[PDB]
Amino acid sequence: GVVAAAEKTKQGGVLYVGSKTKEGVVHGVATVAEKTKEQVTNVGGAVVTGVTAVAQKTVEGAGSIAAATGFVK
Amino acid sequence: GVVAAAEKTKQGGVLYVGSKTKEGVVHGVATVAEKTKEQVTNVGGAVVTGVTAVAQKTVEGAGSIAAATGFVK
Amino acid sequence: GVVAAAEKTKQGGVLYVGSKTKEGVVHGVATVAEKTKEQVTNVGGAVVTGVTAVAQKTVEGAGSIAAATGFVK
Amino acid sequence: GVVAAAEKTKQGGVLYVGSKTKEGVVHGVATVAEKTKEQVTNVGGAVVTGVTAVAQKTVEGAGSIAAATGFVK
Amino acid sequence: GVVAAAEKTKQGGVLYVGSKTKEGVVHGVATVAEKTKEQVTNVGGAVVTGVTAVAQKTVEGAGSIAAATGFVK
Amino acid sequence: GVVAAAEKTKQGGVLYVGSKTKEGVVHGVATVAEKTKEQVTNVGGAVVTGVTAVAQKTVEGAGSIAAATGFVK
Amino acid sequence: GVVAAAEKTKQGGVLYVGSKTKEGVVHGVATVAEKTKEQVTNVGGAVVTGVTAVAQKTVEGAGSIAAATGFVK
Amino acid sequence: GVVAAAEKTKQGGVLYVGSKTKEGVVHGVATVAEKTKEQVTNVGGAVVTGVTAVAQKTVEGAGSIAAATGFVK
Amino acid sequence: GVVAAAEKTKQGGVLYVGSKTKEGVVHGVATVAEKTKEQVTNVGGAVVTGVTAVAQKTVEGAGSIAAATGFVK
Amino acid sequence: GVVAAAEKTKQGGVLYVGSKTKEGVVHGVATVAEKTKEQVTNVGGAVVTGVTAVAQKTVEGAGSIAAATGFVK
Numbered sequence A, B, C, D, E, F, G, H, I, J: 001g002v003v004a005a006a007e008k009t010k011q012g013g014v015l016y017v018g019s020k021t022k023e024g025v026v027h028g029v030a031t032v033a034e035k036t037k038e039q040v041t042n043v044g045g046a047v048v049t050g051v052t053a054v055a056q057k058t059v060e061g062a063g064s065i066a067a068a069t070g071f072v073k
Helices: none
Strands: A002-007 A016-020 A024-026 A029-032 A047-049 A052-056 B002-007 B016-020 B024-026 B029-032 B047-049 B052-056 C002-007 C016-020 C024-026 C029-032 C047-049 C052-056 D002-007 D016-020 D024-026 D029-032 D047-049 D052-056 E002-007 E016-020 E024-026 E029-032 E047-049 E052-056 F002-007 F016-020 F024-026 F029-032 F047-049 F052-056 G002-007 G016-020 G024-026 G029-032 G047-049 G052-056 H002-007 H016-020 H024-026 H029-032 H047-049 H052-056 I002-007 I016-020 I024-026 I029-032 I047-049 I052-056 J002-007 J016-020 J024-026 J029-032 J047-049 J052-056
Touching (some): A016 A052, A047 B052, B016 B052, B052 C016, C016 C052, C047 C052, C052 D016, D047 D052, D047 E052, E016 E052, E047 E052, F016 F052, F016 G052, F047 F052, F052 G047, G016 G052, G016 H052, G052 H047, H016 H052, H047 H052, H052 I047, I016 I052, I052 J047, J016 J052, J047 J052
Parallel strands (some): A002 B002, A024 B024, A029 B029, A047 B047, A052 B052, B016 C016, B024 C024, B047 C047, B052 C052, C002 D002, C016 D016, C029 D029, C047 D047, D002 E002, D016 E016, D029 E029, D052 E052, F029 G029, F047 G047, F052 G052, G002 H002, G016 H016, G024 H024, G047 H047, G052 H052, H002 I002, H016 I016, H024 I024, H029 I029, H047 I047, H052 I052, I002 J002, I016 J016, I024 J024, I029 J029, I047 J047, I052 J052
């Protein structure tokens, strides 16, 4: 019995980034495995991956994540 | 029994990014495996992947993610 | 029994990005596997992948994602 | 029993991106596998893939995604 | 029993992108496999793939996606 | 003053190769460049390129190669 | 003053190779450059490139290679 | 003044290789550069590149290689 | 003044290799550079590169290699 | 004044290798640099690079290598 819910109702800065680089190698989320049952992901926020990875104001509301497994009985 | 829901009702910055690079290698989400039952993904936010990966104002409401498995009985 | 729903009703910045690069290799979401039952994806947000991957205002409402498996009985 | 629904009713920035590059290789979503039952995708948001991949205002309402499997009985 | 529905009723920015490139290779969604039962896709959002892949205002309502499998009994 | 000469005068094994493959990509000699004066090649031996590239008894005599440049004065 | 010469005069094994592969990528000689005067090659032996690249008895005589540049004066 | 010479005059094993692989990436000789005067190669032996790269009895005589540059005066 | 010479005149084992692998990446000779005058190679022996790279009896005579530069005066 | 010479005149084992591997990364000779005058190589022996890199009986005679630079005057 898996339920997940979010309401956002409404009744009504500066950033300078400069990267001068050479040779980046960037990974985001990785799950790596061998011989597995499940590999879930739920991204109810964000996954931001960049050499210059700016995430402004990123979740401004109402994330809802359920996740389950199990119940072998 | 899997339910997931979101309502957003309504009744009513600066960013400069400069990347001067050479040679990026960027991964986002990766799941890598061998010999698996499931590999789920649910992106109820965002996945943003870039060399210059800007994610502004990214979720402004009402993400709903359920995820399940199981119940072998 | 899989249900997922979202209503958005209504009753009523600056960004400069400059990437001067050479040689990017960018991956977004990848699931890679061997010998698997399922590989699901549900993108109820976004997947944005770019060398210059800007995701502005990206989800402004009402994402609903259910995902399940199981029930072997 | 798979149900998914979304209503958006209504009763009522700047971006500059410049990528000067050479040689990009960009992947979006990829699922890669060997010897599998299913490989689903449901894109109830967006998948945006570009060298310069701008996703503005991307989901402004009412995404609904269900996904299931199972029930071997 | 697969149902999916969306109503949008109604009772009532700037972007500059310049990519000066040379040699892009861009993939969108790809599912690649060997020896599989199903490979579904449902794009109830969008899939946008470009060297310069701009997706403005992309889903402004009422996506509905169901997806299922199963029921071996 | 470029001179090159070879005389072969005359006054008088087993190999099993089996390649069972799938998907080869083979390059031989490549010179790749940008903005160049000369790109010479002289093949006074052999260039053998194959997925299964057998070169038996390949030069049995008398290769002569000169190569020059220069002399700006 | 470039001279190169070879005389072969005459006055008078087992190999089993089995490659069972999948997916090779093989390069031979490569010179890769940017903004160059010369790129010479002289192959007064052999260049053998293969997934299964057997070079038996390859030079049995008399290779002669000169190579020069220079002399700006 | 470049001279190179070789005479071969005449007055008068087992090998089993088995490679059972998957996924090789093989490079031979590579010279890679940026902004160069010369890039010479002289192969007065052999260059053998293979996934299974057997070089038997490879030079049985008389290699001669000269190489020069210089003399700016 | 560059001279190189070799005469081979004539007046008159077991090997088992088995590589059972998965995923090799093999490089041979590489010279890699940036902003260079010369990049010479002279192969008056052999360059053998393979996943299974057998070099039997490889130089059985008479290699001659000269190499020079210089003389700015 | 560069001279190099070799004469081989004539007037008249077991090996078992088994590599059962997974995932090799092998480099041979590499010279890597930035901002250089010369990068020479002379291979008057052999360069053997392999995952299973057997070099039997490799130089059986008469290697001759000269190499110089200099003489700025």
